[PDB]
Ligand binder design. Structure first.
Ligand SMILES: *[C@@H]1O[C@H](CO)[C@@H](O[C@@H]2O[C@H](CO)[C@@H](O)[C@H](O)[C@H]2NC(C)=O)[C@H](O)[C@H]1NC(C)=O
Ligand SMILES: *[C@@H]1O[C@H](CO)[C@@H](O[C@@H]2O[C@H](CO)[C@@H](O)[C@H](O)[C@H]2NC(C)=O)[C@H](O)[C@H]1NC(C)=O
Ligand code: NAG
Ligand code: NAG
Ligand code: NAG
Ligand code: NAG
Ligand code: NAG
Lengths: 160, 99, 99, 249, 120, 49, 50
């Protein structure tokens, strides 16, 4: 956060500092074996990309090979070896935000991975994303540092 | 058409996001709109030029999107300031202001 | 950097060139600054019986880095059969001399 | 072997309306419940398509310019239409493409053939004389009141020959039925040759000769934009011609 | 994910930082807009259980206990009638809390007049 | 009227559509502004003679 | 050559459209003010000072 803000003192707040990427683990070329449910680099008949290949309920017509959504992005594909339909979910990219009080007060921080489930990264799951380093409490206070979706963080340790 | 004002904002935001996505399919004068195809078909001295063309086109698209988002944000901020004024003066009190 | 090459290979002493001595003998970076100097030396670096003192790397597994020198006189495996440091079928010396 | 057919009856060619036919899938991409605007060689809606008959004495086998693409509509019963003649000069000087469907299979050949002036087949109850230099041969599975409707689209793009086809069960007696049916892509051929002229291949019925009852339609493909509707199951159910009228525009 | 593209993109400087900062300013501005419009009371008022308002009926604008969303019938109708590096940040105030703020404003203006906007 | 220029311009995508849409929005906004300012009555009142 | 002319003219047109959008926002604010004055000064008597 100090590196991003170009300052040695950080004011109390939430600062988006980095971009979480689910790194591709394997390379699947189908024209090797096929690996599903993982963020892999797929190469299907010259069409390459990175994604999670899951089972699809979309029934393609026999002449069709790839699938596109409204925004013309490839979200469905057919494996050439075995004629099955696979959904290509994009890997869980997210924004890494750092929630901290003032450095005059404390050096404790919490990390928010925006729009990322907590199983794909004091760990709490919010609709905004996964918050690591903040203890979730059942009490309600005024909002000090906004997290989102009704979640706020404060220092009293860091609580959400 | 009762709730057209909110639907226009939703449609404009969705259409701007869709246009920003569809700008990725344009090559902007390069041989292809895909970076992988350029990196696999050409050596780095010419792939650098083609990637530079794609970079400047996509950067121009992103700047255009951010600029129009800022203009729409100013419009929405004006509407929200008006809504806060109506909340203070029409709901929290009785207003003598005509219309 | 001083060396002796052929007459047709002087185009390969340049940034961003694809070629044979560019890949396996002498590579220049894409951001190279400086000057390449070439002059004919048929009167000095040639013999009527054949001047074989100048050698080039005919065979290598991979392209060089910029400003990388390879003087290793190890054998090359040009086939499926391993060579075990001995010349033979599809086993060639990497350094061959200009005639 | 060639035979001149000298028992034809002179009649001008007919014309009729295309309605909303001739649509095909522009690519191999599945689309679900979305509207896609595409710029390609398409057949114009409600266009003037040339109508040819085979009835007894009518035997319509002329040579027509290919242009940028060919839409072939066939109101067919008993399988009289068997194949097509593709080329530029239709002689041994150049290389020509032959499409035939005999009693067993379909044969696609790119060779230097000597075409007859009147090529035909025959069924008992003769299309070339020579073949010199062949470069491509491809044997495939058979594609096939008027009971059958056969739609075909032939395109020559970048040396690729695209054949799109659709089989439709109809019960209309004379003209083209009014409806919507998108043509699936059937086969892409790596031919890499120039084609500017085509000719239909018919089959005779012998019992001289008799022509079986068939009717076919020729339409020409033009570069235009279509707005295609894709349903939940991914089939094209409706289309809009962007250059037909201001409403569809 | 192209590293060569990012290496060439570094030649253009801090354009990406400016775009991200402008979008962040817009994103916090939206939450500020919602805060200015709806969070005008710091007391959450409730209507009495007996809706005896001298014949005046507010059932279409008061929250419906039968609905799980705790919205008014008018608010429920309004919510039903409105239908690559990109992320959508959730709003700070959820629809339930905005509905709760409107419920507090309605309860204040029904039970207390304009007095709650100027003091106790 | 250069067809080569338009063919090269189609490579840049929907910039032209965006600009036309923005100008159309401004054009209808001007009529909305005049409608909001001056058309505040639906009855055409007349002074006595 | 046409690529250079196209990028220059497209930049000029984008600059013009952006300036027009900002001026349109200013004129819209002025028109909203004028509509408020029409409602509160012409169609009624205003207690708002100045
Ligand atoms: C069928 O008729 C055609 C046209 O009348 C014949 O083609 C001609 O054949 C003669 C024979 O030497 C040539 O001199 C002409 O140049 C041909 N004309 C054209 C336009 O090619 C054809 O030969 C006839 N078939 C048979 C079997 O005789
Ligand atoms: C207040 O208004 C509501 C809604 O108009 C009334 O509820 C209706 O009551 C009648 C008979 O009691 C029913 O037939 C309707 O179906 C009800 N409508 C709804 C939407 O529930 C209610 O009676 C009114 N009075 C009070 C005291 O609540
Ligand atoms: C089709 O063309 C013929 C002449 O080629 C013409 O007589 C006829 O009227 C045309 N039909 C339509 C529907 O335009
Ligand atoms: C059909 O044609 C193919 C090749 O031309 C041939 O092998 C086959 O025997 C033919 N069948 C009949 C029934 O003529
Ligand atoms: C084509 O056929 C003719 C006649 O058989 C022959 O003379 C010629 O060499 C052939 N051309 C090629 C390229 O084989
Ligand atoms: C294709 O054939 C036509 C007619 O014979 C001719 O005009 C055209 O130039 C040919 N094209 C090529 C590329 O040979
Ligand atoms: C799509 O397919 C399903 C079969 O699962 C069928 O029930 C439905 O009617 C089809 N819809 C259309 C529009 O064809």
């Amino acid at each position: 956060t100090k590196c991003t803000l170009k300052s040695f003192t950080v004011e109390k707040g939430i600062y988006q500092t980095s971009n979480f990427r689910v790194q591709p683990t394997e390379s699947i070329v189908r024209f090797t074996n096929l690996v599903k449910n993982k963020c892999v680099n797929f190469n299907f008949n010259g069409l390459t990309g990175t994604g999670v290949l899951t089972e699809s309920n979309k029934k393609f017509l026999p002449f069709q090979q790839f699938g596109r959504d409204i925004a013309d992005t490839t979200d469905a594909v057919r494996d050439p070896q075995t004629l099955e339909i696979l959904d290509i979910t994009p890997c869980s990219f997210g924004g890494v935000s750092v929630i901290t009080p003032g450095t005059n007060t404390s050096n404790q921080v919490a990390v928010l991975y925006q729009g990322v489930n907590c199983t794909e990264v004091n760990v709490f799951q919010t609709r905004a994303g996964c918050l690591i380093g903040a203890e979730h409490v059942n009490n309600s206070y005024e909002c000090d540092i906004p997290i989102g979706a009704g979640i706020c963080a404060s220092y009293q340790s860091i609580i959400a | 058409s009762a709730l057209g004002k909110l639907q226009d904002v939703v449609n404009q935001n969705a259409q701007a996001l869709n246009t920003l996505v569809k700008q990725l399919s344009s090559n902007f004068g390069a041989i292809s709109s895909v970076l992988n195809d350029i990196l696999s078909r050409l050596d780095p001295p010419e792939a650098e030029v083609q990637i530079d063309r794609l970079i400047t086109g996509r950067l121009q698209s992103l700047q255009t999107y951010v600029t129009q988002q800022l203009i729409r944000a100013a419009e929405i901020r004006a509407s929200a300031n008006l809504a806060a004024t109506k909340m203070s003066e029409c709901v929290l009190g009785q207003s003598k202001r005509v219309d | 950097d001083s060396f002796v090459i052929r007459g047709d290979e002087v185009r390969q002493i340049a940034p961003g060139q694809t070629g044979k001595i560019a890949d396996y003998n002498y590579k220049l970076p894409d951001d190279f600054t400086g000057c390449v100097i070439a002059w004919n030396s048929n009167n000095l670096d040639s013999k009527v019986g054949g001047n074989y003192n100048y050698r080039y790397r005919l065979f290598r597994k991979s392209n060089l880095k910029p400003f990388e020198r390879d003087i290793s006189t190890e054998i090359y495996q040009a086939g499926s059969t391993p060579c075990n440091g001995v010349a033979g079928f599809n086993c060639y010396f990497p350094l061959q001399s200009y005639g | 072997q060639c035979v001149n057919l000298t028992t034809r009856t002179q009649l001008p060619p007919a014309y009729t309306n295309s309605f909303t036919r001739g649509v095909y899938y522009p690519d191999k991409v599945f689309r679900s419940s979305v509207l896609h605007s595409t710029q390609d060689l398409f057949l114009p809606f409600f266009s003037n398509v040339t109508w040819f008959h085979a009835i007894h004495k009518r035997f319509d086998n002329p040579v027509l310019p290919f242009n940028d693409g060919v839409y072939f509509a066939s109101t067919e019963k008993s399988n009289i239409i068997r194949g097509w003649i593709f080329g530029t000069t239709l002689d041994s000087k150049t290389q020509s493409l032959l499409i035939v469907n005999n009693a067993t299979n379909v044969v696609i050949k790119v060779c230097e053939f000597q075409f007859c002036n009147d090529p035909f087949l025959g069924v008992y109850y003769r299309v070339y004389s020579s073949a010199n230099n062949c470069t491509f041969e491809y044997v495939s599975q058979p594609f096939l009141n008027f009971k059958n409707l056969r739609e075909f689209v032939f395109k020559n793009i970048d040396g690729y020959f695209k054949i799109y086809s659709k089989h439709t069960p109809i019960n209309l007696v004379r003209d083209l039925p009014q409806g919507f049916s998108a043509l699936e892509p059937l086969v892409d051929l790596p031919i890499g040759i120039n084609i500017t002229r085509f000719q239909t291949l018919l089959a005779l019925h012998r019992s001289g000769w008799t022509a079986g009852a068939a009717a076919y339609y020729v339409g020409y493909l033009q570069p235009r934009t279509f707005l295609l509707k894709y349903n939940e199951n991914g089939t094209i159910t409706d289309a809009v011609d962007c250059a037909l009228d201001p409403l569809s525009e | 994910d192209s590293t060569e593209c990012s290496n060439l993109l570094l030649q253009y400087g801090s354009f990406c930082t400016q775009l991200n900062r402008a979008l962040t300013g817009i994103a916090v501005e939206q939450d500020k807009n919602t805060q200015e419009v709806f969070a005008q009371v710091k007391q959450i008022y409730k209507t009495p259980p007996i809706k005896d308002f001298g014949g005046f009926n507010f059932s279409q604008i008061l929250p419906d206990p039968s609905k799980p969303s705790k919205r008014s019938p008018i608010e429920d109708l309004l919510f039903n009638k409105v239908t690559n590096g990109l992320t959508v940040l959730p709003p700070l105030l959820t629809d339930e809390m905005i509905a709760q703020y409107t419920s507090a404003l309605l309860a204040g203006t029904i039970t207390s007049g304009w007095t709650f906007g100027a003091g106790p």
